[PDB]
């Protein structure tokens, strides 16, 4: 009747780390990806770090065409996809592909085509538009272009939740294993918005870090916070029924054993102050994979590193797990990745668990007073992690959690 | 175990009525919402009609100073749901608020709002970037805001798979409710892309429709078909389990029953020649239902009035139903509403189960020679609808199809 769902490969892109090797060893090590902006010119802007993948192995799997087909948005989706499948020896051919899925999330899709195509439009007119800006722009179309790769027939769709967007889209592809409608997906997020308006866009509402030392800009849980540092790239996974996945004799990295969604409902941008709606995230997360509380050895937390969030999000974690449960948050080492947080941020925690070691909040050195969650700082920690979960809330009120089973 | 998926009200504002009144008069007495574009200057561009709402109820529910938090996209969604809730006399205050839940679908979001702030970036600065550009812009924002307007503090997320984010949103409420994850689900789509930047796109892509004639522009399976007329609006549905309808005394005016999704993986901007996804997507569909190609009394098309897509979409349409069931594309009334289509095409679906009535596709006179499926046109044709299905087919592969039941 029900399925288990299972991680067999994962691929990313990120401001640490293009392999899973390279990723792991930043979070190890304590190598941070917060740098001086060079994408564009941002000399009249107030913002002048963010998290930039400044060696892209384009030449991995691209040719000098592929620039022009496809908006970085979907290069990024395309490359960690690949290296999912790579990774999880997982033989495209072999598959019925009738039950084969892709979900890509995108918060803002292919958004440097559209700022450039509009900016094209007013000075030279509509028949000078480029005839593939949509195809390369619209949010969906990455997971088109994934599904299309890899010879993909079953579900395709894409999911917005904002900063919550990869988590839901997981979820969303677990629920879909755990209950029978597909044996296997490829599933995560990307995002490719550092660029002058996303950035300008961000920096109008207040949201980024203004914060010169980049060593010093995302400091999650932090006493000083002042906004989030902007990042980029694609996480993707291969996750599989338990049953296909030992049917074809896969390595399991990991198990996806519960999934809540919930929503503030309170305001556009803020969160709850207390974190009533991750609270009951938190719950459904758990209840899902029947497991207590006590059982949750490790916290990846949503930790923007924003003065509102991480007083909501500590406030609710305490209430749900305790004082003592690890927690930390890696956007002090990728940037906030936004609609590929959560698909990034699932690869931290499974990482974490199978390397027994819960990577430190980088940057931060005193958290806030009112703070009471064991926030990990200074260097990470030594320890058994049966089971973690990972969480998001994105602006518009959308909170998700993913709990995880280590593989044993 | 498993629920039964009932829907219990409905909203809509759209080129041919802001009320399901208006709306269904306009499909039975052959009203189409196709005319000249008003929205922006367009004596340089190719295209030069439009299904535009020209009279939308602003002030039934909004004032002045909304146009600050919420671009048009926005404005669509939340009309359609409050008059959905009503027509549902749906009290927000009496529900497990955390058992109530939101999805609405969008192909492009809030593209007014980027494309102006984009240009106001380039001629400014970012000093005058609005702060409001990203929480009106957003395409998840509108999901956010209707949780926001009601108390919906269970799931909420946006979906986008193109023209068929609508079908999927609503496929995606239908299995929440079946599976016991929620009780309550307002879900539907918006979009309000008829802007330069937007027509430009699909003009540039070749997918629109030059004709002067507006009468003759979209004219779905015709011979003389040449391109899509892009419309704008909203469809919002009120889906409830059957037992939480039943205990409050609903009256339901039909019921979900089967959902299929695939992918064509074939190419980015055309269908599969054959339409061997859609045909997969059908069965799907017909095989959570559990009934036979047979009892299929109704089939509302996607037909977006493109050479390619009613090629394919026939012979799909034959291949599963035969060449006997009624067939039209309501997209010769309302244009083609992109991420909102198939909310209000369910609508129509819904409707016309109610008055035992299939609306004829407009404009249409002639079908093309190879055109095998029994396409209705010149005028309705009055018959028992039991069982009905509504498709729609998206760039980038997506195909979607849901299944209704005619409630007794
Ligand atoms: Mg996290
Ligand atoms: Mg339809």
């Known amino acids: 009747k029900l399925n288990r769902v299972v991680v067999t490969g994962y691929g990313v892109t990120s401001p640490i780390g293009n392999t899973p090797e390279e990723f792991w060893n930043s979070l190890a090590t304590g190598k941070i990806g917060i740098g001086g902006i060079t994408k564009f010119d941002h000399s009249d802007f107030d913002v002048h770090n963010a998290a930039e993948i400044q060696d892209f192995p384009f030449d991995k799997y691209f040719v000098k065409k592929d620039t022009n087909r496809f908006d970085n948005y979907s290069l990024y989706a395309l490359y960690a996809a690949q290296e999912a499948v790579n990774h999880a020896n997982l033989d495209v051919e072999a598959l019925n592909r009738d039950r084969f899925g892709v ?13 450039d195509q509009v900016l094209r439009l007013h000075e030279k007119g509509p028949k000078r538009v480029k005839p593939m800006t949509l195809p390369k722009a619209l949010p969906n ?3 088109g272009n994934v599904a299309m790769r890899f010879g993909a027939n079953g579900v395709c769709k894409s999911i917005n939740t904002a900063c919550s967007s990869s988590n839901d889209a997981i979820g969303d592809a677990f629920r879909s294993i755990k209950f029978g409608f597909q044996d296997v997906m490829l599933v995560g997020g990307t995002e490719a918005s550092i660029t002058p308006f996303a950035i300008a866009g961000f920096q109008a509402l207040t949201a980024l870090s203004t914060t010169e030392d980049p060593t010093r800009a995302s400091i999650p849980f932090d006493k000083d916070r002042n906004g989030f540092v902007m990042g980029e790239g694609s996480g993707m996974l291969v996750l599989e029924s338990l049953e296909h996945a030992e049917k074809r004799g896969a390595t399991i990295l990991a198990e996806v054993v519960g999934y809540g969604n919930t929503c503030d409902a309170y305001h556009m941008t803020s969160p709850h102050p207390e974190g009533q709606g991750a609270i009951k995230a938190i719950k ?15 916290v990846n937390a949503h930790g923007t590193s924003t003065p509102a969030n991480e007083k909501g999000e500590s406030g609710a974690i305490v209430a749900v ?4 449960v690890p927690v930390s948050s890696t956007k002090s080492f990728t940037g906030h990745l ?3 947080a959560g698909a990034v941020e699932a690869i931290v925690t499974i990482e974490a668990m199978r390397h027994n070691f819960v990577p430190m909040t980088a940057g931060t050195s ?6 009471e969650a064991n926030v990990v700082y200074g260097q990470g920690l030594e320890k058994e992690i049966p089971y ?6 994105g602006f518009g009120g959308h909170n998700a ?3 995880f089973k280590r593989w044993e």
Chains 1, 2 share one sequence.
Do not use: R, W
């Open 401 to 403: 959690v993913l709990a």
């Open 388 to 393: 973690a979960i990972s969480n998001t809330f």
């Open 321 to 324: 797990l305790g004082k003592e």
């Open 338 to 340: 936004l609609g590929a």
């Open 141 to 143: 179309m990455a997971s």
């Open 284 to 298: 459904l997360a758990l209840e899902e994979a029947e497991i207590s509380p006590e059982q949750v050895a490790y």
């Open 366 to 371: 005193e958290v806030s007073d009112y703070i």
């Open 103 to 115: 979900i890509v999330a995108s918060g803002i899709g292919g958004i440097k085509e559209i700022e």
